[PDB]
Amino acid sequence: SGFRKMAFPSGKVEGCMVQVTCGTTTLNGLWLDDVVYCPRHVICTSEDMLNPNYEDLLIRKSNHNFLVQAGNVQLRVIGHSMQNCVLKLKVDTANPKTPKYKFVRIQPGQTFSVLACYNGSPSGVYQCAMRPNFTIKGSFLNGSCGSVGFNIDYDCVSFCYMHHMELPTGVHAGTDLEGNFYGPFVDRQTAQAAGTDTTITVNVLAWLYAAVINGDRWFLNRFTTTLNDFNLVAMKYNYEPLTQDHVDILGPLSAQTGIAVLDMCASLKELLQNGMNGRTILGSALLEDEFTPFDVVRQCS
Amino acid sequence: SGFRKMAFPSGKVEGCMVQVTCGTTTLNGLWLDDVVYCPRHVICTSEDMLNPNYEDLLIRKSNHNFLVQAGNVQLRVIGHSMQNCVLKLKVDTANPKTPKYKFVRIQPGQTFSVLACYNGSPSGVYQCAMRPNFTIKGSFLNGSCGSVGFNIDYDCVSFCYMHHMELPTGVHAGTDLEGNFYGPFVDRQTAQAAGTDTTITVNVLAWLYAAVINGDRWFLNRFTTTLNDFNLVAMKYNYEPLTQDHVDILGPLSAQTGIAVLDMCASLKELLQNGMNGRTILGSALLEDEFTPFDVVRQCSGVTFQ
Numbered sequence A: 001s002g003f004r005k006m007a008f009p010s011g012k013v014e015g016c017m018v019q020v021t022c023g024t025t026t027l028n029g030l031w032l033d034d035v036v037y038c039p040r041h042v043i044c045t046s047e048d049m050l051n052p053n054y055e056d057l058l059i060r061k062s063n064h065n066f067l068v069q070a071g072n073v074q075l076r077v078i079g080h081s082m083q084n085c086v087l088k089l090k091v092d093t094a095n096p097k098t099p100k101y102k103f104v105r106i107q108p109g110q111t112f113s114v115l116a117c118y119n120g121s122p123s124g125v126y127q128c129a130m131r132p133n134f135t136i137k138g139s140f141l142n143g144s145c146g147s148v149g150f151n152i153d154y155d156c157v158s159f160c161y162m163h164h165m166e167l168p169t170g171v172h173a174g175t176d177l178e179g180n181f182y183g184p185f186v187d188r189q190t191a192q193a194a195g196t197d198t199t200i201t202v203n204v205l206a207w208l209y210a211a212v213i214n215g216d217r218w219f220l221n222r223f224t225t226t227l228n229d230f231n232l233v234a235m236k237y238n239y240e241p242l243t244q245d246h247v248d249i250l251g252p253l254s255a256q257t258g259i260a261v262l263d264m265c266a267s268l269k270e271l272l273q274n275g276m277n278g279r280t281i282l283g284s285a286l287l288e289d290e291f292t293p294f295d296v297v298r299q300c301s
Numbered sequence B: 001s002g003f004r005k006m007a008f009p010s011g012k013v014e015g016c017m018v019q020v021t022c023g024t025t026t027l028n029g030l031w032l033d034d035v036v037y038c039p040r041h042v043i044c045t046s047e048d049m050l051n052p053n054y055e056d057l058l059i060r061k062s063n064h065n066f067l068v069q070a071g072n073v074q075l076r077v078i079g080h081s082m083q084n085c086v087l088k089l090k091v092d093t094a095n096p097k098t099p100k101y102k103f104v105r106i107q108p109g110q111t112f113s114v115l116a117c118y119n120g121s122p123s124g125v126y127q128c129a130m131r132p133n134f135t136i137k138g139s140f141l142n143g144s145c146g147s148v149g150f151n152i153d154y155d156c157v158s159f160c161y162m163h164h165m166e167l168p169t170g171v172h173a174g175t176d177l178e179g180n181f182y183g184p185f186v187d188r189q190t191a192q193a194a195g196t197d198t199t200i201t202v203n204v205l206a207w208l209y210a211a212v213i214n215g216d217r218w219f220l221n222r223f224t225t226t227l228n229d230f231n232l233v234a235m236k237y238n239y240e241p242l243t244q245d246h247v248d249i250l251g252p253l254s255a256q257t258g259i260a261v262l263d264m265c266a267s268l269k270e271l272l273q274n275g276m277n278g279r280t281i282l283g284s285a286l287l288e289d290e291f292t293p294f295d296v297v298r299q300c301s302g303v304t305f306q
């Protein structure tokens, strides 16, 4: 019983964090096997960012210009290359603490744990969702660049986010570990902005189920709805559409509580229109959308 | 920018978790040097818990009646002893992943991270507070007993909590690592229940300071209050009394933001009496009390661990 914002244990990722220095800049990197991954903007000065030619900037760098340190030890850099917006530093030692891992690109709505680091050392761990507008709402300061986001499933780390920049609105932008940005962002100095955001409907439904597992019931009503009618209401209130896959993914929580998916949608429908009436669900006065149906199953069953 | 409920990195603690099995019961243990610490209720059958005589139960166990496993390697038990509500199993090898560590007893209102574990395998980590009523509002299922709570101080893990039971309201009770319970709970089947709880005032104020640091300023107003006047309103909404010590420890956040402590109390007074009128603070439509003053400073100043 209980329901908390729970992160993955971070130890397998802590064993991969390093510090990467190129000239006057230091940021974080991720050491897997004999490669260190970090944002390619490490190689840029402030003046370079106005109009960078990353391929030329990198031609003017050599292996010796990159200082890589794992705790107190310098790694020898023996090669360098760029894949999209990620720099890959080859080093002469494979990380002995390399976990089982994969790189995955996640969809909006999906959650992960962030290990916020500075200078290759950890500050803390917390859960984030990829927003529909491809930002995350993290907690990050200068020098957090190169911190990563991940999930852990049957002993295997799936890295899905590398942190690159904070946007003027105070939210965060980055890439997958193949170096492709999430959303319309770029690693140079230009006006760029996140669009309008929406609420992750399937996550809100998963959280309602969680509330029912923990004994909340007051929002269940006597009504039902169709998927198409629910989606008409959702759009008015800037909620993402709910798809049949979503319904299917919510099956297990449906099974466990007795509450048909469309009946829970009928509950949300009334909440979207009429609000929470001064009431709380699982410790909150707003509808929470950063728990997936898998986050809920993991903690509640 | 941003302000999250941030847990400690858990790697130093993950390397200490093991499984302990006695009869049909399996729960988690903490392996530090050549000792394994776990709840002593591991030695009890369901029959025994009505009125356990732990020293009579324990004297009847042999070393070989305990099965301790690190992963799927057996740690042979070579000695046992009880200290308060914790069992200490001496084992035949020292954990080579033992971090620097200390046992510390925390006070109510203080915060720590829980590493929730099942069958000796960590499943996740979250940050929570010790409630005024000495419970924790954790997230735990059957099997979680022996899971621990901790803080990190530079390179040192300060262990503060070991999980023993869920009470009937769905909150959590346990001990320090010397096996003394927080609060008036006991490790037997009783009708014990969670006493009346309050909101941790100082922590709410700390989080309003976090909000200001992050640019969320709408609840700042032109009024002030005295400490005594404030406490009258605190009493009515079931908030802990604010003391001059609490006022002192908000000193640094006050200095950083330029908002006097008693002006921030004036802002909270108004939020209590009026509510939020539809608005949010740091993404919440409720007043949050699980960040301490030091927690705000640590996150906002990018403190790391070694």
Ligand SMILES: O=C1C[C@@H](C(=O)NCC(=O)N(c2ccccc2)c2ccccc2)c2ccccc21
Binding pocket: A041, A042, A044, A045, A046, A049, A140, A141, A142, A143, A144, A145, A164, A165, A166, A167, A172, A186, A187, A188, A189, A190, B001
């Ligand atoms: O969460 C973060 C990470 C950090 C950040 O935003 N880094 C970005 C950054 O430093 N640059 C850059 C700038 C000048 C030379 C080279 C790179 C940048 C610029 C444009 C596009 C992409 C990268 C930060 C700073 C202050 C507060 C919060 C935070």
Ligand SMILES: O=C1C[C@@H](C(=O)NCC(=O)N(c2ccccc2)c2ccccc2)c2ccccc21
Binding pocket: A001, B041, B042, B044, B045, B046, B049, B140, B141, B142, B143, B144, B145, B164, B165, B166, B167, B172, B186, B187, B188, B189, B190
């Ligand atoms: O958060 C937890 C941990 C788990 C718990 O509360 N276990 C308690 C428990 O197993 N016993 C006991 C019982 C029979 C023999 C021996 C011990 C118990 C009884 C009284 C006093 C203290 C210990 C649990 C069960 C359900 C949901 C959530 C949770």
